[PDB]
Every structure is written in C-alpha cells, then in structure tokens.
Tab-separated table of C-alpha atoms in Angstrom:
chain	number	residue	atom	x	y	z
A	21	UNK	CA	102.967	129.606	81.562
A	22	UNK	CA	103.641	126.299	81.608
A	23	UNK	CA	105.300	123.435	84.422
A	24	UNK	CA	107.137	120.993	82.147
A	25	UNK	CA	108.994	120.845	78.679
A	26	UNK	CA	107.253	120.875	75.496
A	27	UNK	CA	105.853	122.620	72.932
A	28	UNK	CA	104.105	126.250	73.500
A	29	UNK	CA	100.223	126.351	75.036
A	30	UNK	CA	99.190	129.730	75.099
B	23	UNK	CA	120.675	98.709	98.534
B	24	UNK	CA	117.791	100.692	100.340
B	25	UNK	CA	114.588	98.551	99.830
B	26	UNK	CA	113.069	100.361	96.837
B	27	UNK	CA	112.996	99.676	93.317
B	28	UNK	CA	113.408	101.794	90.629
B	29	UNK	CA	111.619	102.148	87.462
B	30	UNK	CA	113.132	101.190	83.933
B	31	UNK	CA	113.507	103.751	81.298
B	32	UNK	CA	112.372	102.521	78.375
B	33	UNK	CA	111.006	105.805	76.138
B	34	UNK	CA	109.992	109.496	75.991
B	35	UNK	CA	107.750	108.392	79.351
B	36	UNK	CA	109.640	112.236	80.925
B	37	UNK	CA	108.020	112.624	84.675
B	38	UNK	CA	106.128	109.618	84.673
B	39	UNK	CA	108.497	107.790	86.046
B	40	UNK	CA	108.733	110.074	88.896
B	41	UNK	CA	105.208	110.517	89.121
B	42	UNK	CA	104.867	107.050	89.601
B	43	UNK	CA	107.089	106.910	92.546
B	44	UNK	CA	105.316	109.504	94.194
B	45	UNK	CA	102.109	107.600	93.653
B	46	UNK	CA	103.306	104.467	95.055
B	47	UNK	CA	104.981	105.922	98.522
B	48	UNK	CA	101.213	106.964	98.726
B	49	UNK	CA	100.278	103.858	100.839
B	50	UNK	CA	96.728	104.783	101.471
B	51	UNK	CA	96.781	104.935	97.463
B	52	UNK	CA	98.379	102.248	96.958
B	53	UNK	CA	96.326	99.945	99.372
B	54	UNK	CA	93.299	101.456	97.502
B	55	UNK	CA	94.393	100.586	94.268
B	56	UNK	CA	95.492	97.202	95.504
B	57	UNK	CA	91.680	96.452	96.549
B	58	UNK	CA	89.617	97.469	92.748
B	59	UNK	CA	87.701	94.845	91.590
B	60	UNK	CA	89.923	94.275	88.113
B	61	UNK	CA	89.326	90.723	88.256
B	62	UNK	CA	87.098	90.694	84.674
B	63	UNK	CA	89.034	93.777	83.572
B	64	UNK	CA	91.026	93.365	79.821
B	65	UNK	CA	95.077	93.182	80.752
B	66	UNK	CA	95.833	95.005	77.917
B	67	UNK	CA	93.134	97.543	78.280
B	68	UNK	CA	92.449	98.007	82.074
B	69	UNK	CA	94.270	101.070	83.411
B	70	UNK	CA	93.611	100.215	87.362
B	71	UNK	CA	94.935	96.758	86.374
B	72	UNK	CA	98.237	98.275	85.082
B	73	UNK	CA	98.881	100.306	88.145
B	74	UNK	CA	98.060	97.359	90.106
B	75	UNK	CA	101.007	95.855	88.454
B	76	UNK	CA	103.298	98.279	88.799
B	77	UNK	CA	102.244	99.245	92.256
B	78	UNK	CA	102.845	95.087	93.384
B	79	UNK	CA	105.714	95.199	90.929
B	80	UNK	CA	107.472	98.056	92.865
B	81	UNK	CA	106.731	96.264	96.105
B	82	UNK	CA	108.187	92.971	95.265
B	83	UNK	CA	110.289	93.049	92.505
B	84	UNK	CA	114.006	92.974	93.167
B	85	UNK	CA	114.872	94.327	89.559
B	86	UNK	CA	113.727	97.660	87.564
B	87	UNK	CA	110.152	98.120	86.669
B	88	UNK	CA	108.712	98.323	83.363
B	89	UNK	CA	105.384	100.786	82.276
B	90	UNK	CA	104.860	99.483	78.836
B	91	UNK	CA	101.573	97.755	80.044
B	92	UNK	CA	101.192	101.168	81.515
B	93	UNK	CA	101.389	103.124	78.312
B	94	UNK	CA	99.716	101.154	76.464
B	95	UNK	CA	97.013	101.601	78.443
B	96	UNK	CA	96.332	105.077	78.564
B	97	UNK	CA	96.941	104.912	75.246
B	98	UNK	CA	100.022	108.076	75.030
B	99	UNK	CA	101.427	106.749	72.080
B	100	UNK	CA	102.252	109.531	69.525
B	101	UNK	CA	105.679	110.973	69.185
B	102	UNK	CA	104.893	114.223	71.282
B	103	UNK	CA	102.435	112.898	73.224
B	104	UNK	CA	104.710	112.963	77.237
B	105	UNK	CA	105.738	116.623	75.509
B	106	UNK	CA	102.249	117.692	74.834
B	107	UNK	CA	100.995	117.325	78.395
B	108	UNK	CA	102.157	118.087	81.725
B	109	UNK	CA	102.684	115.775	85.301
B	110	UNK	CA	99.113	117.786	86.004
B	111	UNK	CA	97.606	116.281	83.509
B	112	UNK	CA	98.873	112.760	83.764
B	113	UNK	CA	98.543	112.690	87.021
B	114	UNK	CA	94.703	113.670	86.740
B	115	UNK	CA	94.270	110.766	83.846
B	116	UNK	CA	95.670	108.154	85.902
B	117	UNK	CA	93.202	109.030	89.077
B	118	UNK	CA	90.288	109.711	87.008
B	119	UNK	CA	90.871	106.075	86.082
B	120	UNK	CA	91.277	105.292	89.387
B	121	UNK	CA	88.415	106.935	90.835
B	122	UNK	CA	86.250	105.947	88.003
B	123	UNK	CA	86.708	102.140	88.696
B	124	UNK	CA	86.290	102.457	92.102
B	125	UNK	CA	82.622	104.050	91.915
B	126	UNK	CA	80.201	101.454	93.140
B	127	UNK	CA	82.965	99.772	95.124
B	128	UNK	CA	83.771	99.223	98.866
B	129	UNK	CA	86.844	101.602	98.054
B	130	UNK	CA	84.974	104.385	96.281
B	131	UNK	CA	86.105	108.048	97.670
B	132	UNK	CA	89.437	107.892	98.235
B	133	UNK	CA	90.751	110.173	96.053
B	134	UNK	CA	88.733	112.807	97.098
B	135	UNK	CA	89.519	111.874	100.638
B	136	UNK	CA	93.280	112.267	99.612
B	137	UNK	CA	93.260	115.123	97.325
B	138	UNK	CA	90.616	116.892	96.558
B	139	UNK	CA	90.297	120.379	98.398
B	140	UNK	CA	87.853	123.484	98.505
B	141	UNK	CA	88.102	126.778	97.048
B	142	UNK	CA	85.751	129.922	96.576
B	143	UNK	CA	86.075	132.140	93.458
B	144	UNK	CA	84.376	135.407	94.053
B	145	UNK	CA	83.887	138.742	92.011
B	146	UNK	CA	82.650	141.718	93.592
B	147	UNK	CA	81.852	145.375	92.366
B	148	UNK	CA	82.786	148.063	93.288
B	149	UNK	CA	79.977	150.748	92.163
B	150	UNK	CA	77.178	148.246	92.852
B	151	UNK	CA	76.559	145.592	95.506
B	152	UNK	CA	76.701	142.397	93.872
B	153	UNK	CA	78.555	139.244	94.553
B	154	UNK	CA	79.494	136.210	93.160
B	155	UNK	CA	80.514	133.150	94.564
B	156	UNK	CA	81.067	130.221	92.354
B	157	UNK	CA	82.574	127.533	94.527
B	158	UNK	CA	84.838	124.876	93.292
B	159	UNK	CA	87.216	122.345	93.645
B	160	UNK	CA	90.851	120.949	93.663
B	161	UNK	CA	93.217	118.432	93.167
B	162	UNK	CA	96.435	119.916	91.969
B	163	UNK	CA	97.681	123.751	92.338
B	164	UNK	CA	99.989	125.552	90.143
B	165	UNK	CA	102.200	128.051	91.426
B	166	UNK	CA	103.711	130.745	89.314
B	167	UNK	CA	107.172	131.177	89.824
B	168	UNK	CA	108.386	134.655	87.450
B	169	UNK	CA	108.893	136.918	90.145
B	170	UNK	CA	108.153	135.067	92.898
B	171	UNK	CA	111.016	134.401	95.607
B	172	UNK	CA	109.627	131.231	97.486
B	173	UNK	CA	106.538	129.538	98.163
B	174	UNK	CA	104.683	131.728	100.176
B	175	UNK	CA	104.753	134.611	97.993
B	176	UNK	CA	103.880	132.439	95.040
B	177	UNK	CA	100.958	131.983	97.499
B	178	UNK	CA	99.894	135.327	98.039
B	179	UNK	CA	99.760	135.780	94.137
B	180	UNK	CA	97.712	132.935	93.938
B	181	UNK	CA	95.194	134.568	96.300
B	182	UNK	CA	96.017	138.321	94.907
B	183	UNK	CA	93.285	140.507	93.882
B	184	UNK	CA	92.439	140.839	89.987
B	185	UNK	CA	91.290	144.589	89.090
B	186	UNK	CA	88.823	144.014	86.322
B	187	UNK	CA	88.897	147.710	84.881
B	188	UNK	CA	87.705	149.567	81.790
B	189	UNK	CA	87.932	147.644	78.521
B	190	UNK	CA	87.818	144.793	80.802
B	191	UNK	CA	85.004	145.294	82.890
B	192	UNK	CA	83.228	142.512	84.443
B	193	UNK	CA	79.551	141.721	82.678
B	194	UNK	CA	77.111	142.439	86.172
B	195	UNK	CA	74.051	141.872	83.744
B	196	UNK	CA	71.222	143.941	85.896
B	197	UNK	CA	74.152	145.913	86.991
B	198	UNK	CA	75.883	146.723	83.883
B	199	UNK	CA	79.259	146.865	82.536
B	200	UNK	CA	80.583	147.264	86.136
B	201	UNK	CA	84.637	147.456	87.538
B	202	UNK	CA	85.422	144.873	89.849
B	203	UNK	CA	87.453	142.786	91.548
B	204	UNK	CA	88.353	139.100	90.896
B	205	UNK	CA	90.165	136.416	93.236
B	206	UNK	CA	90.468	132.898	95.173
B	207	UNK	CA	90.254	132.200	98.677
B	208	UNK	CA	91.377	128.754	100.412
B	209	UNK	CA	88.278	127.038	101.591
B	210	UNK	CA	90.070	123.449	102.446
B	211	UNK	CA	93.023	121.893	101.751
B	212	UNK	CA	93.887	118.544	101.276
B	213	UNK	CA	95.691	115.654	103.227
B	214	UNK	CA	97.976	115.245	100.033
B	215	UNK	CA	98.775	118.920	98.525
B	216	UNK	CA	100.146	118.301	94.714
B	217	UNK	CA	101.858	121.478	93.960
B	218	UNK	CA	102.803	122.330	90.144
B	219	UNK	CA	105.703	124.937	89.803
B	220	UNK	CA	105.371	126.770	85.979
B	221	UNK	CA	108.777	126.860	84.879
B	222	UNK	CA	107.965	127.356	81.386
B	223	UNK	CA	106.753	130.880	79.909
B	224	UNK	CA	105.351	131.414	76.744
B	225	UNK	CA	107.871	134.049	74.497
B	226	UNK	CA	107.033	135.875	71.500
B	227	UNK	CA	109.673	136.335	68.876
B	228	UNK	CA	111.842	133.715	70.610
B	229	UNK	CA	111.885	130.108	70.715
B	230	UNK	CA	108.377	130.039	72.214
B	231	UNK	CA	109.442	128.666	75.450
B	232	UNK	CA	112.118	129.754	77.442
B	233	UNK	CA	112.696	127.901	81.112
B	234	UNK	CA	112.298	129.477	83.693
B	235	UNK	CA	115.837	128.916	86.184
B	236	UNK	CA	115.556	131.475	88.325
B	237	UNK	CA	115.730	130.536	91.989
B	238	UNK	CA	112.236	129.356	94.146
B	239	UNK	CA	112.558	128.038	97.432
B	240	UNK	CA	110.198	125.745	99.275
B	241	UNK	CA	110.665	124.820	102.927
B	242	UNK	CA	110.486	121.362	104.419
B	243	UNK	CA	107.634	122.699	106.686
B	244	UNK	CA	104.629	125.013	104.419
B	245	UNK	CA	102.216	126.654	106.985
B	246	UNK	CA	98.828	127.423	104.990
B	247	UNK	CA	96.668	128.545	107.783
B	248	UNK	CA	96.934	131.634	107.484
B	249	UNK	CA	95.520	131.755	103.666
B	250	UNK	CA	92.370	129.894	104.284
B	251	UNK	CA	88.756	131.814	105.281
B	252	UNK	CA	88.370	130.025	108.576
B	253	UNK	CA	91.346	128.292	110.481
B	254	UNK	CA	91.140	125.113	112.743
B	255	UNK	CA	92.592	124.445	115.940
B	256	UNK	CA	93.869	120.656	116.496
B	257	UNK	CA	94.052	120.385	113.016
B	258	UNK	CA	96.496	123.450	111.539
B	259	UNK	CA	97.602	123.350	107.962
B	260	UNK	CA	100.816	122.570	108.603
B	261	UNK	CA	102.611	120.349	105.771
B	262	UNK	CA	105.290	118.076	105.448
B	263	UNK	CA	107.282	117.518	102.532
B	264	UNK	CA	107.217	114.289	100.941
B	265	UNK	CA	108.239	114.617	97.380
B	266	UNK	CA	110.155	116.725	94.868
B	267	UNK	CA	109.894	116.336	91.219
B	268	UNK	CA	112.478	117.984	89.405
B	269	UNK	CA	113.863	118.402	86.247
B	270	UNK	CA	117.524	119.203	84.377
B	271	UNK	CA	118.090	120.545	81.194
B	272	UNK	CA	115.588	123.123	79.191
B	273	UNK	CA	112.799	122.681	76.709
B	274	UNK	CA	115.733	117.133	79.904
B	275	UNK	CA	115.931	114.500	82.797
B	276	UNK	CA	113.695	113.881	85.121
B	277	UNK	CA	114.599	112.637	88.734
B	278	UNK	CA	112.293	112.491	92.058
B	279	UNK	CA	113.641	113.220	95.819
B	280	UNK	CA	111.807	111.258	97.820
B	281	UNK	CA	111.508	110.329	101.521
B	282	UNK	CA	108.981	107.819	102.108
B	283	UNK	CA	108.732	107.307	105.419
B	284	UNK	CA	108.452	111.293	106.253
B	285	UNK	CA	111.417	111.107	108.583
B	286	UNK	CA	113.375	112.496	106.391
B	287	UNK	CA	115.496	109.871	105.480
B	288	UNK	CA	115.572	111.413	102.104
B	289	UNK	CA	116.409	109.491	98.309
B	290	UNK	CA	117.044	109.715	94.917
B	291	UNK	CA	114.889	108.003	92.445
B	292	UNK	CA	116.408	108.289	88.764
B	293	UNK	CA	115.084	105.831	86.751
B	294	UNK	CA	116.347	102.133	87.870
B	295	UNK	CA	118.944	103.776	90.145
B	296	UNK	CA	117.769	104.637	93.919
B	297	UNK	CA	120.085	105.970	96.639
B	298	UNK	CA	119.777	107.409	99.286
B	299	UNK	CA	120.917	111.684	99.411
B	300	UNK	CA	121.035	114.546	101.820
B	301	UNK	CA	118.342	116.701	102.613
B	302	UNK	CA	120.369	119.349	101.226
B	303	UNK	CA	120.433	117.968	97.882
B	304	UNK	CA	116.851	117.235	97.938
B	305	UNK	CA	115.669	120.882	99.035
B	306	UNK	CA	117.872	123.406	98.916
B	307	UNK	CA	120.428	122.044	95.841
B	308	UNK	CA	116.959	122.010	94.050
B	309	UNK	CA	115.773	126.161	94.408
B	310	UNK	CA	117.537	127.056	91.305
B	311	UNK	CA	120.158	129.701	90.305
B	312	UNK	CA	122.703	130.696	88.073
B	313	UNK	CA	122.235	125.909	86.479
B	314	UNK	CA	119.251	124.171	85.027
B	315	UNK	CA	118.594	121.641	87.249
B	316	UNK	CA	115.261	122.390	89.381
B	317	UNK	CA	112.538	121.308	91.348
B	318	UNK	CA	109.186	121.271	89.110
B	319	UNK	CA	106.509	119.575	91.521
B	320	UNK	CA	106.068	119.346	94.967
B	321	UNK	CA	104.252	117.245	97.088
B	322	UNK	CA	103.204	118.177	100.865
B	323	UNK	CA	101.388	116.064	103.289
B	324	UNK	CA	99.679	117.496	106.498
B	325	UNK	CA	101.019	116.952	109.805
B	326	UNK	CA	97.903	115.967	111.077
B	327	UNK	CA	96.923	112.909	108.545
B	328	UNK	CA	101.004	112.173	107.617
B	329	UNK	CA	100.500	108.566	109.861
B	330	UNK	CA	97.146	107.699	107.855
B	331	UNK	CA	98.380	108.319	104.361
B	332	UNK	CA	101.587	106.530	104.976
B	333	UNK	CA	100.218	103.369	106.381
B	334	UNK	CA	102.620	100.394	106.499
B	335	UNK	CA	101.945	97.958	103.740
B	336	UNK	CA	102.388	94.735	104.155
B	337	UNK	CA	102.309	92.055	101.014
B	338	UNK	CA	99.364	90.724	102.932
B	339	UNK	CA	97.546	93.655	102.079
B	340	UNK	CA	97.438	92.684	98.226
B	341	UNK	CA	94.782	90.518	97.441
B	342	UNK	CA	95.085	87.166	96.817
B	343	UNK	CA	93.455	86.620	93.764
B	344	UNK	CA	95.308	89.466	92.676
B	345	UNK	CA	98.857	88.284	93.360
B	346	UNK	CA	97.389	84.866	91.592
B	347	UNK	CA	96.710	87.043	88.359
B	348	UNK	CA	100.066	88.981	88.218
B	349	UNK	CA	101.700	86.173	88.956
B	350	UNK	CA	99.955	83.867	86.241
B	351	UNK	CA	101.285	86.367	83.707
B	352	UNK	CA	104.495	86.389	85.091
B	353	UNK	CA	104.541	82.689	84.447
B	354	UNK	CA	103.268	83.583	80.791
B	355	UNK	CA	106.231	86.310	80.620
B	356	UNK	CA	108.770	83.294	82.089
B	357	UNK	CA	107.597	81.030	79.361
C-alpha cells in the first residue's frame, strides 16, 4: 500500500 | 483576492506545494521557524533558511511563490525523485531539518510539542503468560483505505488485533514458538494529527499500482477518545479539520482545501491560484466514487489547542535581521 503516485514499494 | 498567496509551479515538485501550504497556516510553526538562528547558515545549502523564505515569502509577497531555493536544498533532484517518495516522507525531511536546527536553541521542542504522539505496541500469548510492550512514537499515521468506509473504521483496523498463528508464530524465546496476538493502542495524540490515506495498492500481474477511488469519508469533527487506553476530561480528543490534501488523476494534480482560520471559511490552493470554495467541495466532493479526484492527506487539529497552534502572526513577529537578509537577496534578485 501506498498514499501517493509513483512507482511500486512493496 | 482573499489574502493568501499561492505557490508557483515550476516542476515535478507533486504535493509539495500543498504540503507547504499546510505547513505555513501552521502559525505556531511558522513563528518557530521564523525564530532559528540561520544567520551563519549557507543560502544555498541551509534548509531552515529556505523555509524561512518561503514561509516570509508567503506572508508578504503579493505574487506566486517560488521553491527552487527549496529544492535545491533538500537536494530532490533526480527525475523520479517527488515519485519515489511520499507527502510522509517529505514532510518528515523537512521537520527533521527543522527540529535538528533548532536543538540547542531557545525554540528547541516544538515539533514534538506539535506532532509527535504516543503509542504502545504489544504482543501477548496465548498458551503462556508473556507480554511485550515496546512503546513508541508518532508523527504521521497512515490509514488504509481498501475496505474501509470512513475514518473511523479505518481506525478500528488500525487498532485491530493481528493473530500470529502457525507458520507464523511469534518467537517467545524462553517460551517457545508460541501463537499470539499482535496490535497498537493510542497512548497520546497530538495537537496537529497528520493523517496519510493509502490510495495506492501494490498489484501483481497488472500495472503494479492501481489507485485506489473507491469512496472514504472523513468528517469535519474526528472524535478519538474512545481509541486511546486512558481518556481525559477537559481535554477530549476531539479534532477539527484544517486541511485536505488531495489528488486527481491515477499513477496527477495536486490541490489543498484549506481553511486557515478554523472557522471554516474554507479555500482552494492550486498552485498560484487561491479562492475561496464551499465546504462541500472541500469535504464531501473529496470522499471519492465512481471519478479520480480524492482526498489523500488529512490534517486535524484538537479542539482544545486549535487557538494556540493558530496564533495570529503579525510581520512583527519575523525577525529583524531576518527580514534584513531576505530582503538583501531580494535586492541581489532585483539587480
């Protein structure tokens, strides 16, 4: 999960 | 037009923009930052000095503000580098900075004072009677959103019990491979509550991120009592709204609803244009549903210290060798 745009982090 | 200035777009800066906003109708912030000892700081390379600049740039200027003298110094430079990170993690550079400077100074502690809250992880057994209760702390919280219909059950997630079961048993040492249980409890929370929404979900075989549109309300009014340990009469965790970050598009533009004063007397910050806007348009046109334009941050300030962090600011308040400074280089810049 993430709270902005952008490229995957996970 | 209504006494604010706006913020010039001049790259890939994304939420900064609106971050900064939000960190400017901070007054105690802002009076803070106004007061850091910058005076043998680098301009180029002094982060506190660039907010200064913005911050007295904001107050005074009549025309859009520029953050290149902010950028630079932070030093977020590479082609992905707003994309990479997230308004958490800017926001957490910028007062680390800020905090950092103001150690040894007559201002030191006041983003703690501001932000910083308490929170107690524990993990229990269940077979044997042990307990852990690592204790830690808080400046921003972020809220999961998949599934959850507004802010209070996002909430209760937050604080939901974790079942650590077989073939992921929790390590008790003495104890053994032991099933447990794993959660967070509210110890404190904060005059100034930064709350992150995730609005972005990792997806395998798919385009690795799909945004997450689906509708999440938040009210103008968040009671918290009732999800910390040990309550507080004459001082209730009742918040306020103050700001609302949001976002348009998918993985976009980024625009902040903001109501400085916390009378509601709502506006719209995008960019170099401010106007003023409903309530409705700030709250409720921001939940989500099915379009792609939706509220990403939130920021909440309690009832009960809403006077203190919103202190009037006068331009007395900025320092006089200060002013001197930015105005020196706005002489340079005028040359």
């Amino acid at each position: 999960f993430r709270v902005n745009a952008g490229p995957p982090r996970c | 037009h209504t006494g604010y200035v706006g913020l010039k777009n001049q790259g890939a800066t994304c939420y900064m923009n609106s971050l900064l906003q939000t960190l400017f109708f901070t007054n105690q912030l802002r009076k803070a930052v106004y007061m850091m000892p910058t005076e043998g700081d680098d301009s180029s390379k002094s982060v506190p000095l660039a907010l200064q600049r913005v911050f007295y740039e904001l107050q005074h200027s009549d025309k859009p503000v520029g953050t290149k003298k902010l950028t630079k110094s932070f030093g977020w430079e590479t082609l992905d580098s707003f994309m990479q990170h997230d308004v958490q993690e800017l926001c957490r550079v910028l007062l680390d900075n800020v905090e950092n400077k103001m150690k040894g100074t007559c201002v030191e502690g006041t983003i703690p004072k501001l932000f910083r809250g308490k929170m107690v992880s524990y993990i229990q057994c269940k077979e044997v009677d042990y307990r852990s209760d690592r204790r830690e702390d808080y400046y921003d919280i972020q809220l999961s959103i998949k599934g959850k219909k507004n802010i209070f059950e996002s909430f209760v997630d937050y604080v939901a019990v974790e079942q650590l079961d077989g073939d992921n048993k929790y390590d008790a040492g003495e104890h053994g491979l032991q099933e447990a249980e794993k959660g967070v409890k509210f110890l404190t929370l904060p005059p100034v509550l930064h709350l992150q929404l995730m609005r972005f979900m990792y997806d395998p075989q798919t385009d690795q991120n799909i945004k997450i549109n689906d509708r999440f309300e938040f009210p103008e009014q968040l009671p918290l009592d009732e999800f910390l340990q040990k309550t507080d009469p004459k001082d209730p965790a009742n918040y306020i709204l103050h700001a609302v970050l949001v976002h348009s598009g998918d993985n976009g533009h980024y625009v902040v609803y903001l109501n400085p004063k916390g009378d509601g007397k709502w506006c719209k910050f995008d960019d170099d244009v401010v106007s003023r806007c409903t309530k409705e348009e700030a709250i409720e046109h921001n939940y989500g549903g099915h379009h792609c334009t939706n509220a990403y941050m939130l920021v909440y300030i309690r009832e009960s210290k809403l006077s203190e962090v919103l202190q009037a600011v006068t331009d007395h308040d900025i320092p006089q060798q200060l002013v001197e400074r930015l105005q020196e280089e706005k002489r340079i810049e005028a040359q």
